[PDB]
Design a protein around this nucleic acid. Structure first.
Ligand code: ADP
Ligand code: BEF
Lengths: 99, 452, 92, 93, 84, 98, 79, 102, 89
DNA sequence: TCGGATGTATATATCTGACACGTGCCTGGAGACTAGGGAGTAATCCCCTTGGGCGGTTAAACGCGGGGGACAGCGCGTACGTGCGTTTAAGCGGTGCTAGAGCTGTCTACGACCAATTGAGCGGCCTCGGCACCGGGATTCT
DNA sequence: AGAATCCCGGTGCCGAGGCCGCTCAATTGGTCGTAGACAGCTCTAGCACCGCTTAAACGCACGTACGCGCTGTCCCCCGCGTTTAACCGCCCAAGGGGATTACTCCCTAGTCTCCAGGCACGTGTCAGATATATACATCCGA
């Protein structure tokens, strides 16, 4: 189905998940489409930043450290993932008022 | 030594057909006084090439000693320890150039396993010889994985109990000693008994204690039960039911609300049947070891040991004591040391060179340290105690072949005095359950012996 | 037996960075992130439909779930893209 | 070396790594003793104790780095137990 | 009289570990009274989480604390854990 | 002339304002403020008169809570006066914007 | 419109007194005026979203209470 | 026609609680002991808060509970201050607190 | 609203104390808030186990998770006493 | 250490406007049957948490200079508190008056339910190179 | 000047990527019944203009006491080196535990039928507010 929409995520599986969790009694037709588009958008914006952080370290495969750095640089994602701890991602390097 | 001459006739043969073998010679005879004989047979003319020997820590010492006493001059060297092993590596001899000075490489299972890299570089080893085959009875053991990285053009396995648990240990060994026996399909043995004897006649070579020479008078393994005393019964019920951690917690000097050790009742009931102090010492800190020193008599099995020992001092022939844990041997030592007896002890906690000299002293006949504490896996394999004459197994289980290897420690070529064995136990108790399990395991063992 | 978002995240990654790959730990991190966001948006949509008296979850309250859950400049793009898909879904 | 120079070596070394800073076996023993007072005769999955350590270490690292803002606010460089209490007072714990 | 070889488990968290955690926090000098304060706030945090993770396990009739109970217990307290 | 020493009329004010429950800002300027703020998100809006009351009473309980812990930051630093440093410390170890 | 200046200095001092403060620096007022605006912007942006979902043109009193409960600030006394 | 509350020995409306549990569809089915349990818990918490508030009102030599007394009772007690940690009772006020010279 | 029932409980603990019109609003809000916390925790508890029924075990676990220690300890006993009287009597 | 300026703390009143009962329908209770299945309580195979060991060897514990950071004290001066005399503007009340929020009535479209397909995905086969991973030397350093 | 460090050649090996046989999920088609949207009306709900009063904000002057900087002392924390003992460990063993599937029952969801509650509106009865009065208690300066 979800080729008529230009998405890469499964609209059918999203609808199965929405109707399984019993969030409501009836689920419209545009709801899985909308929810599947706004998930691939967020995946695409995290992955681009992670790949950019991979490129600086002269690496060709992303690792958890790269997701950590990409999330902690950008303001919007750090505001959204403000209480998450990326299993083994280290910390953002920082020094204060001293040599 | 005739048998040992048939022992060198069969490993010169193995060398010929290009085969690999399991020297399952009876434990308590030959083996090493037969290994170094084959090793001189080839060191003569055939040289040593890359020659490597791996063995338990306790034996490495005995082996060096034997070399120093049987063979006139076999370039040899004990590669024990770490960092200090780096210097002797080169003050050994040229790197790969093998000459009449290239010294026999003797290592341990840890060293072999931890730094195989160093020895990986060496040439196809003429003969790797593994003293205790039982170490490799698991086919997923990390030692086996690291032992394949070595480029070995010949293999050899020394043992006295080839199979102990089941047939799969026979399966894992075969694949190793002889990968021509891959047979990684559960094996086809499973009438068939004869069919197995066709595959195994070619390599396995076993002897027997009776052999021909009288030498060691027949031994006697006898089970002398004891009656569980009242206090132990109280402890046992408070566990069969519960609230033991609390009834005993009535005191609980330390670790308040001590963790209910209600795991594997069998174990927390075996520890009782060994000595109730083990439980009391933990629920309540009791920094002080039983101060009455007659609360040890509350243990029935302890009291049967004491009387046995008083009757065996009536003659003074030296005894041997074995145990499963080390807390219990410690209680024993405390008890006897209070009376004043001089004791020697080698468990796994004690160091190697330290335990070697203790024996060299225990072996001193003039010295009157008759008692000798010794934990099973601790030092129940590779130690000669011809000085002692009687073995007492306080407790042993889960694998009967574990015990036998100990009994022989005392009973081995050179033991003139006839040997007894006193497997103590408590009647109508968890101990009998284990005893029966062991009998079951032996039952299997005797079906294996009929096979022989 | 166990269903996840591995295929779709991998395809999106190949669409963004044609040559970068991804390990397994990062793949699990990304799967968890998508599950978290889905749960957040869906629960807010359900509760927000419950504030009014309606038994139906349409698309226009996926709008406002997004506008409540996502911050600032992130939502203004996401909302837009959502509308895009729905149009291309129906006038197809 | 002079007092205070191999410390900054340690701030730089440990903020690059990702590995665990508490030894595994004592931490496991601790989490087992502080659950004996909720439910006796309890067992843990091996991944359940790795997840507790990841969260605890993250918590302590996050608390140490605003305990350090309080010490600097008071014009010091040494963290004192008074700073931890100010930091936890305002975070709500 | 010998035998007794025990210590409060609380100590297994050693002074070097606490200094490593502080160094990753950015701290340069540490007083000698920090260690017993950290060692006390850690226990409070940890026994707040284990108490809920064991409650989540008692409900399911299990006897094993799984890695998912711990994640739910952490999410109940405002902190989310990605990657398990 | 009969004057009071500095900081004695301030302590009777603390006791006065910590017994009352009244609403301490002028009502009209607050309404003009909230209408000016809301004038961005949607234009030509109407405010039910009980909503501005809810906003005012939600906004003062926030400032009173922020002041009573920017005053813990000042006492930690050996003072009795509050400067903006204390507000920024308090808001940064609360995460209000970090 | 300078409606943020309508939060006068005496009112800020009254709020600080209820907070327990004894002395105020002279730069506190422009800091407080700025940190109030952020709080109001967040709450009002959520309230107006709730309003526009209902197709109403009047911010009501639950829109505010719902916006507040969503950001950790539960308020009793308004429905 | 005895009500459910009298059978359970409560003062809260077991039947109205059961209807509130159904409506909103928290799930599909609802047991017969769930509303009785929930009503008993709600009555317990109510009596706890009301008792503390009545004590606080007597302490101020009054005979009518007002929001100030609820504020005093809630923020003096430990578990209630943990539970109602981040709630604003309206037309109440903070309790007296002067620290140091401040 | 719950006002009727709330008033009843008051006349059990303080037979001579009354309540202001605004204090009853507070109490109503408190009851409505607690009910919804407990009913949502029970919903999650049932969904994590894939069961379609909210019995009186989900309520007990929701109480243990939501109410603070000493408070939850007494709420549980009250509720179990009520259910026992309901089924037995 | 007294004597004085006020400040709160007790006691007189009135005065609301509220909090309290008593009505009225009208919607939600409870009661009785029937249906389906959703738990409940079994029986079995296993992957899996739970003791000993046992080495061993990093990491932890102990001790010893010695400096550099915390803390106390002292002086200066600047910014904030107290009180007083203007100046705005919030907050009482009166007029209206539109712009909504709420309810009801009506039909067309839209989503749940159900049968029959079939191609998506998941668990499990292999295979190779991008992670690491080791020495070994030029460069900074305080 | 003895100490600190990156880059560049040398190292394996096991986890990421491909293939796969498949089977159960998601697609197409067809019905039905009831949620939408919508149009019409009514009555609240909100906003805005005006005049008056008075309480609060605002400006100002003094003065002082609190913030901030400088200096000295001493103590405790850091860096380094040796020795002990512990975590990451190789092995051992039984086990209990944990997610599997089983007829069986009884326990909730329905469709309904009426007695019962409750909520809204219409009235009084205050009691805690507030203002005037009166002591009884406290900052303050000398
Ligand atoms: N051929 C022999 N010549 C001399 N002494 C021997 C001979 N065989 C055995 N012994 C003596 O008996 C002891 C036991 O034999 P040993 O080789 O140690 O047995 P194991 O086979 O258990 O290693 C030897 O240490 C030695 O004292
Ligand atoms: F070397 Be023997 F087996 F004691």
């Amino acid at each position: 189905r979800s080729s008529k929409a230009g998405l890469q995520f499964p609209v059918g599986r999203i609808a199965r998940f929405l109707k399984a969790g019993k969030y409501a009694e009836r689920v419209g037709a545009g709801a899985p489409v909308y929810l599947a588009a706004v998930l691939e958008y967020l995946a695409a914006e995290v992955l681009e930043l992670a790949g950019n952080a991979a490129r600086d370290n002269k690496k060709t495969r992303i690792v958890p450290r790269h997701i950590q750095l990409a999330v902690r640089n950008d303001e919007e994602l750090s505001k959204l993932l403000g209480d998450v701890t990326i299993a083994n991602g280290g910390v953002m390097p920082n020094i204060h008022n001293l040599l | 030594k005739s048998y040992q001459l048939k022992g060198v006739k069969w490993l010169i043969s193995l060398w010929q057909n290009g085969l690999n073998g399991i020297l399952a010679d009876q434990m308590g005879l030959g083996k090493t006084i037969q290994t170094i004989g084959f090793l001189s047979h080839l060191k003569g003319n055939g040289l040593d090439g890359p020659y490597l020997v791996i063995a338990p820590l306790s034996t490495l010492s005995n082996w060096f000693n034997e070399i120093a006493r049987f063979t006139p001059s076999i370039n040899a060297i004990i590669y024990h320890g770490d960092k200090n092993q780096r210097d002797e590596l080169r003050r050994k001899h040229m790197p790969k150039t093998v000459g009449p000075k290239f010294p026999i490489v003797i290592t341990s299972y840890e060293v072999a396993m931890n730094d195989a890299k160093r020895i990986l570089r060496h040439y196809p080893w003429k003969y790797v010889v593994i003293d205790e085959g039982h170490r490799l009875k698991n086919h997923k053991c990390k030692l086996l994985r690291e032992l394949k990285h070595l480029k070995m053009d010949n293999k050899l396995l020394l043992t006295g109990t080839p199979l102990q648990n089941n047939l799969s240990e026979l399966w894992s060994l075969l694949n190793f000693i002889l990968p021509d026996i891959f047979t990684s399909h559960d094996e086809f043995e499973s009438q068939v008994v004869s069919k197995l004897h066709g595959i195994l006649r070619p390599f396995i070579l076993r002897r027997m204690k009776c052999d021909v020479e009288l030498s060691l008078p027949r031994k006697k393994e006898i089970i002398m039960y004891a009656t569980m005393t009242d206090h132990q019964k109280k402890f046992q019920e408070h566990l069969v039911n519960n609230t033991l951690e609390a009834h005993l917690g009535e005191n609980a000097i330390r670790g308040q609300g001590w963790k209910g050790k209600l795991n594997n009742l069998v174990i927390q009931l075996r520890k009782n049947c060994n000595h109730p102090d083990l439980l009391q010492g933990q629920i309540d800190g009791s920094y002080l070891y039983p101060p009455v020193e007659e609360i040890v008599g509350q243990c029935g099995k302890f009291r049967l040991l004491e009387r046995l020992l008083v009757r065996l001092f009536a003659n003074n022939h030296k005894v041997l004591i074995f145990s499963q844990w080390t807390k219990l041997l410690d209680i024993m030592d405390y008890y006897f040391s209070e009376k004043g007896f001089e004791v020697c002890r080698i468990d796994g906690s004690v160091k190697l060179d330290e335990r070697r000299r203790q024996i060299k002293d225990f072996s001193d006949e003039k010295s009157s340290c008759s008692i000798f504490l010794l934990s099973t896996r601790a030092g129940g394999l590779g130690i000669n105690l011809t000085a002692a004459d009687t073995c007492i197994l306080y407790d042993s289980d889960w694998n009967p072949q574990m015990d036998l290897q100990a009994m022989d420690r005392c009973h081995r070529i050179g033991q003139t005095k006839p040997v007894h064995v006193y497997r103590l136990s408590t009647a109508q108790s968890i101990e009998t359950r284990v005893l029966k399990r062991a009998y079951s395991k032996l039952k299997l063992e005797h079906v294996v012996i009929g096979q022989g | 037996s166990v269903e996840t978002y591995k295929i779709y995240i991998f395809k999106v990654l190949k669409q963004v960075h044609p040559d970068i790959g991804i390990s397994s730990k990062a793949m699990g991190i990304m799967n968890s992130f998508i599950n978290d966001i889905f749960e957040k948006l869906a629960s807010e949509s359900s509760k927000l439909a419950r504030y009014n008296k309606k038994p139906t979850i349409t698309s226009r309250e996926i709008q406002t779930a997004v506008r409540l859950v996502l911050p600032g400049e992130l939502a203004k793009h996401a909302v837009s893209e959502g509308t895009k898909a729905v149009t291309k879904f129906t006038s197809s | 070396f002079r007092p205070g120079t191999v410390a900054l070596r340690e701030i730089r070394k440990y903020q690059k790594s990702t590995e665990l800073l508490i030894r595994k076996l004592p931490f496991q023993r601790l989490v087992r003793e502080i659950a004996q007072d909720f439910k006796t005769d309890l067992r843990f999955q091996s991944s359940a104790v790795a997840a507790l350590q990841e969260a605890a270490e993250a918590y302590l690292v996050g608390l140490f780095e605003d305990t350090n803002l309080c010490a600097i606010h008071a014009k010091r460089v040494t963290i004192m137990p008074k700073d931890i209490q100010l930091a936890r007072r305002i975070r709500g714990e | 009289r010998h035998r007794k070889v025990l210590r409060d488990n609380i100590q297994g968290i050693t002074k070097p570990a606490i200094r490593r955690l502080a160094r990753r926090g950015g701290v340069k000098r540490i007083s000698g009274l920090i260690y017993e304060e950290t060692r006390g706030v850690l226990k409070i945090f940890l026994e707040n989480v284990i108490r809920d993770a064991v409650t989540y396990t008692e409900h399911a009739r299990r006897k094993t604390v799984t890695a998912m109970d711990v994640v739910y217990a952490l999410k109940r307290q405002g902190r989310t854990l990605y990657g398990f």
